[PDB]
Design a protein around this ligand. Structure first.
Ligand SMILES: [Mg+2]
Ligand SMILES: [Mg+2]
Ligand SMILES: [Mg+2]
Ligand SMILES: [Mg+2]
Ligand SMILES: [Mg+2]
Ligand SMILES: [Mg+2]
Ligand SMILES: [Mg+2]
Ligand SMILES: [Mg+2]
Lengths: 248, 248, 248, 248, 248, 248, 248, 248
């Protein structure tokens, strides 16, 4: 079928089609989401937690991501795969950011990268965008004047060239407006329902990590739990000599 | 509770306790299997397929594994985590193998490593074992005289110091004997029911990869499928403005 | 005979001589095109597809090109060999671009390099040109205001020093004008007939890749097919003991 | 359909099926030979001449080959791709040879490697073979006692583990015998008709390089010449304004 | 319980809560201070003396600190761990400073870094702060106009983004004012009692180094002396055969 | 006074003088033990736990030790400072071990190194010893035949050249004998009272880590606890404005 | 006694105390000058000649100096040791100069560095000075307008932060003035008697190199000659069997 | 005049000419000893003390020597310059030793190297000697059987190829014999008067280091003291305005 491209997300904002974005970190997962119809996959730095067990996204390195990106890229032939730039890889300036992004494309095989930041990151977004690298921006709300800054960021980020922007933990009201005020699609996560698209960490979306589903997350299943019995039953059958059988 | 150690596997062979080993490649998965009671986790090179999308286990590199090992090590505090040595990292001889294994322990944080091979690999197993590195052997059956070699390998491998050995695609009959003939535990996968323990790639065990469950694999669930709807439903709700709601 | 130099292309624009440029990626091919009279050879990044099987030109690296350039340079003693700068090697700025180009000349043995881009790349083109490195520009059309930009690019690029410019996927009408408006030769590919010169990927020109000849490509032969029988017949004769004979 | 594996070549020696091996050095060529049914492809060091223009095979480096191997591997999904080890990469001993071969498999994606040499190279062939790396041997005839050595080499090489052996410039008589005396398939090139299989440099097989077809080579076509007109005609049409037309 | 964050220090300045900061350089020490309730730990460059025996803080390198930081980070789960930047690692400018700080966070696991300097270092503090790296400033008094500069530094440093500032060897009077004039907390050491918080090198605080307690330091114990007998008694018991006993 | 040398330990075995060895990992600690009369200091890999918070001694690297050794060397001018070789740095063989040890002497400034292992490590001990590097051996007891091996190790190790040997977790009875059977001093830790000398991790010796003093350790003080109040009191006085006072 | 610091040189200019600076390049020499009371030692790049035999100061590298600096630093505990920056290590700009100087302090153990140059080097002097690195300037006279430039340099250099400045080959008259016009001490060598301090290459000062004592140098001895007999006599006694005697 | 070669030392042993060897570490010193007639110069690792202030010869590195060797080589055109191999550079075996020595010749410009050791070092001496590198051996006496070993070393060392051997701290009686028993010259230092030649550290020979002249050293002067006044007088004249005068 059709391979999602950035322009598709733009058309969808026009046609009013609200698309879904899911986070992915390996081949098998991506394969599933791809044959499930998910148009956009995010190899997020959130992998730091769900994949590597870091209690933050500060330690994860580019090298802990590129190999995962390659895997996701191979598993979702129809999805637009976005590679998230790790903390520290782009804050230095355009040159650094460009080198990092270039690695994600030439090596990781990603189609686009996600650069987190507000106005302070416009220069970087511009360089990449001008280099021909699709950039998905990521802005937030950090408490009044805060709402102003969020807006300034949303504007600056789009001006820089971002083909879309993620609004994380942004007051639904403010989000709604920004969404209507920007020409590019807005992807929300705890941003309210008024965003051109939505994004969730698949681990949360399918109950695969812990049990604490935050407010902005809707638990669409208990894939984690389902895996627990599968394992527990497997274990018992092994102990009970029931497995393997002869057909095995 | 109790952190599984190699001696436990030995005691279990004595008490006739058949234990289950599951493959794992990330923090979240390991966490689940750990709280599911799985005693031994294998960060297999099978990750080459299920994690990175390689159609073989030949290309995967040490660097594509170590970071995954670290994650698994963090997610399974009670399991005995075994790191699998990638193709090419130990065939050169003891020195190479030792360096590679040392990386998996000092860096990966693994408790033991899995070295695939027969007699030809005894020297390597001995060096590591003597260095204080727990080694899980891995022998197979490659078609008559074949059964002899498998036996020779099983013997040589144990002589070298392996604390356990994996029998993959080994005729149940031959396996049964070898199991009874060795002092160390035998972990099978398509080796028959007469092995001190069993091992499966969790992706297959829980139907997370493709649909072709081979003969030696028992599909204990459809975790993959379950994830497909979760994603599909999520997508539709996004399109239907049903998600996010206000509680989000 | 005569070794084509950049000034020749300029004279030809004056004399109204429409010259042909062919893509080349190895010694044997270049040798053929050279003794076939082709004046200009392009070791394009299109090699990413036809040579390495990448589905894009994003992954190909300088190192996957330089050795090919050297080969082409050795096979076409009379042609003006142009080396194409890979994605990511010049977007960072002049310094990067200069280093990359310098490698293609000092190492690759190329006579000139092709830098893809519009106004955004003028700075780079200027640095190289001033360094004494012949630069062939490459501009395109990306949909109204688009035609304006194409023009701006054509102008900026020439101002920067490009000895010629490639117009790819440019509306014949717009192309025609630009061609007449620029002092330097315009080389088209899907740009219409009104260009000082034409360029095609030899694989397409001679039907050596797939069967889908796009609109802008004219299939001058089925060299690929011809190779298929040669191989098939060879195979059968081998099977039929007809080859080798005794004269062999 | 079916992906050729080494055992297939063995079965064929049994069934008396004479198979054909063709040299290949890029994606497009491999694609053609693959859909032409060629079972085995050799990314030979002969590329030194036909690809890079070296007048010998002494200068070509591993790095000038690996990227070509990757391309060939991508173009022939059904063929058994063999990567030839460059001069100097294995003569030092097993350790060196193993490292080199490992690169060709893990990086190049090759299925097997070709190691040129006689008895003096048995140690290397053994190490690789034991490492799980399929090795295609390559022996020759260098003038009386010579025939003895060729035989000794044929024997030693097979003893070392080679799954097949290439006999180049070997007296048909001697070749015939060796072929009958070895358990593994013999692939000839100027070795006579009595070899389990045949191999030719595709450039010669299809008349793509020079015009001097040596005795052991049969010119199955003039693909090179066919390319010359295609180019010459293309050039003239460009000059004659006939190309591009409007359909372009 | 609660993990101290930078905002806590701000709240405390508001509530008038004077907090204590202690220097720490290893896991065991940090563990103690953590379970002793110390909110902020400083892996100081002072380690140069107390840890490595350098008579100055000029020679200590980043590598002699990062591993210590990791240890302290592991020992104080509830403390805000601040890593001090070594001499020479940030004076070159923002780029250098950013790279250094990034190492301390991504590798060292620190939560914040301490950058010593006045106005001259504002640019660096700004870059880090904007990058999302918490920076603790450090200003001093170097003899009239001196008091002016100290003030200028206090102002500039806070303007740059520092979440707090250390006043070392600053006239209590001047300190008092600066403390009242700044919005961010002031941490003193020989700065007088009018600072939002206090800091001491634990070695001095607990009499573990030398016997010369300077004026600004209050000796809260003789932990060093206590260790001397422990050692001396241990030694004598060993000599007296009293140790080990049988319970040992 | 007198700087302890290895021969001193030998004389002491003769005179029946039981000496005490203490572990040390920094300048200030070493200074204390030195002026406390401790003759031998061990910069152990036990630092992995007490210094860096690793739950094992497997991860610690040479680089996490050398800088500590330098510090200890500077703090104990009269002690014989022994540097412990980290896991993985000598198991490969003499060459590796020699390079590692050489670093500890030339860089770390150590006087001797400690190599853990039995017979399997004799070759390494011999190389270093012959190189002029004082080696302290380290053997253990790992459960019958075990006692035999311990003995074999004690013998082999001394034969190799070790100037002394550490017996850790060795049955007092067996230890007693070995001590009497060897010409070189035996240093015990959980080895019983019949050893030429004793060794303890200062953290345990002075109650600085946790509260679980194992059987073989005698808690000579609560230096850790003493540090807790010092810190707690310091904190309260800061909060109570009592500190700093004016004398400060 | 007292360790000379830069402020001492300033006080001395005030008290009118003319201090002497001597060049030094090794431990033994420095030890002598230190116990001889010399306050300032210069590890000059003049070492290029007297130490390494270069006929110029152009070839000497940082690495040929740092190890000498370390030696001098160890030999003169009371002197202010100044390390010279080698040709080419600071002319590129502040960044380069800062890195070089930082090596001399952190590695060499120097207290200050000497940067040769006039106005053109102010930027470098400023960066180092602001970094906390004491810089001794070095200006000269190169023939009218020359005297103006010397003055401009003297001014610029001091403005940049130099704690002192060397006037080499400067007309005594001009020197006298500059000395009176600057706030910082002036150290002369062939600059006349009106300088806050004097400096000479110890080799010349003590007649250790050649015999041609230039005008600005006063030969205070013939230490070189004295060494010649010592050697000659030693040689003869060896030949005469007089040495060694029995007391030897 | 004549440039001393190794054969000269041999002739001298024959003619009974007792030659003198002096240690040297810089250009100026070497120049003096050269024009003083000293035939052999030793760039000893004793430089560790006299040049760099190390209290041992354990820390000095090859890099702290090579540059000094180059200097000495330039200063003594007629002397046979011998470079010493630093601790750790040859104990690993021939390969290591050869590489190290090769650096001293090709880079340092030395004519020969000094390898310290007894029988244990014969292999190394043999490799170098066979490579064409003149090796000066160095054996000692370490207390009965000791005298036997010294002899064994003297024999082994000469057998290995040493063109001469240094006997340090060897009982004059034993020395006398060894001297008469060896075919190669013996150079003593505290070895008695019966050695083909003598060697002393010039610092001791001329009273340039400390005042404690050991038994085996004869103080031929007080060059150090002479330098002290030269410096002291220089200093006073500077202070007294007597220097510089006008002639300066
Ligand atoms: Mg992030
Ligand atoms: Mg495997
Ligand atoms: Mg391109
Ligand atoms: Mg060849
Ligand atoms: Mg500091
Ligand atoms: Mg240990
Ligand atoms: Mg200079
Ligand atoms: Mg020595």
């Amino acid at each position: 079928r059709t391979k999602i491209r950035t322009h598709h997300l733009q058309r969808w904002k026009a046609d009013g089609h609200k698309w879904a974005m899911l986070t992915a970190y390996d081949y098998s997962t991506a394969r599933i989401f791809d044959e499930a119809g998910i148009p956009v996959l995010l190899v997020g730095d959130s992998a730091a937690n769900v994949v590597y067990g870091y209690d933050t996204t500060v330690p994860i390195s580019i090298d802990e991501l590129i190999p995962l990106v390659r895997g996701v890229v191979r598993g979702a032939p129809h999805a637009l795969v976005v590679a998230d730039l790790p903390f520290g890889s782009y804050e230095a300036g355009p040159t650094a950011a460009l080198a990092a992004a270039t690695r994600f494309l030439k090596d990781g095989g990603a189609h686009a990268v996600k650069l987190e930041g507000g106005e302070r990151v416009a220069e970087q977004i511009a360089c990449l965008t001008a280099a021909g690298i699709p950039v998905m921006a990521h802005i937030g709300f950090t408490p009044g004047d805060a709402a102003e800054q969020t807006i300034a960021d949303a504007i600056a980020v789009a001006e820089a060239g971002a083909f879309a922007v993620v609004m994380e933990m942004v007051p639904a009201e403010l989000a709604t407006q920004i969404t209507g005020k920007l020409t590019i699609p807005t992807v929300g996560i705890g941003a309210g329902p008024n965003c051109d698209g939505q994004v969730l960490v698949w681990q949360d979306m399918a109950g695969f990590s812990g049990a604490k589903t935050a407010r902005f997350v809707k638990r669409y299943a208990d894939v984690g739990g389902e895996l627990r019995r599968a394992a527990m039953q497997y274990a018992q059958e092994v102990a009970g000599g029931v497995f393997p059988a002869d057909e095995h």
